[PDB]
Amino acid sequence: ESCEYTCGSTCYWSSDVSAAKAKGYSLYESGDTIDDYPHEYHDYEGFDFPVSGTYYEYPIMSDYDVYTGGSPGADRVIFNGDDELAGVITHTGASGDDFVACSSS
Ligand SMILES: Nc1ccn([C@@H]2O[C@H](COP(=O)(O)O[C@H]3[C@@H](F)[C@H](n4cnc5c(=O)[nH]c(N)nc54)O[C@@H]3CO)[C@@H](O)[C@H]2O)c(=O)n1
Numbered sequence: 808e809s810c811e812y813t814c815g816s817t818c819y820w821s822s823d824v825s826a827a828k829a830k831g832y833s834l835y836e837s838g839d840t841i842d843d844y845p846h847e848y849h850d851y852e853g854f855d856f857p858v859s860g861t862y863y864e865y866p867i868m869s870d871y872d873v874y875t876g877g878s879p880g881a882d883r884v885i886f887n888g889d890d891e892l893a894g895v896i897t898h899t900g901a902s903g904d905d906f907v908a909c910s911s912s
Contacts, residue, residue, distance in 0.1 A: 812909035814882045815899030817869045819909070827884040828892055830873045831865025835888065842876045848885055852906050856885060856893035863887070867895060882909070 810818040831845045840846075848864040856862065863886055866879035883906070885893035895909040 810912050812895035813912060814867075814869075814895060814897040814909040817882065817899075819867060819882075819895060823867065823871055824884060824892065824895060826873050827865055827867040828886045828890070830875075831863060831884055831886055832890045834865070835863055835886075841874070842879070844874060844879060845886075848883070852896075854885075854894060854896065854908060858887050858889075858891040858893050860887060862893050864896075 808820055811821040811824050812819045834840060835845050845863040845865045848862045850860065850862060864883040865886070866874040867882045867884040868874055868880060869882065881898040883896050885896060887893060896906040897909055898904070898906055901907045
């Protein structure tokens with residue numbers, strides 16, 4: 808129950824991240840979307856993610872429910888077509904539609 812990632816003030820447990828990615832990926836895999844998620848993520852920000860691209864983003868929710876439509880909020884789980892985790896990012900602390908990385912702890 809440690810915070811794998813911390814987005815602004817939000818604590819995500821490894822299980823939170825995994826469930827988000829898992830959802831995002833099962834959709835990616837079928838070629839489906841839910842309110843435009845998962846979305847390809849360009850990485851214009853320049854994050855040097857530990858896994859290779861291309862990357863996809865899927866909302867990760869501060870209430871810990873898996874995204875299934877509606878407002879996506881400020882946080883995103885980044886994964887690739889091999890279901891690998893790249894990271895967790897957020898709009899929280901960034902200027903607009905731009906992102907900043909979530910910290911570990
Ligand atoms: N400060 C903010 C800003 C947006 N949000 C919500 O975020 C969503 C949409 O955000 P998001 O999923 O990131 O939508 C982004 C992505 F899907 C898409 N995209 C693709 N590649 C990239 C990239 O490298 N960078 C980037 N910033 N956006 C990208 O480009 C749009 C941004 O222009 C919306 O409902 C907003 O209400 C928020 O809660 N707080």
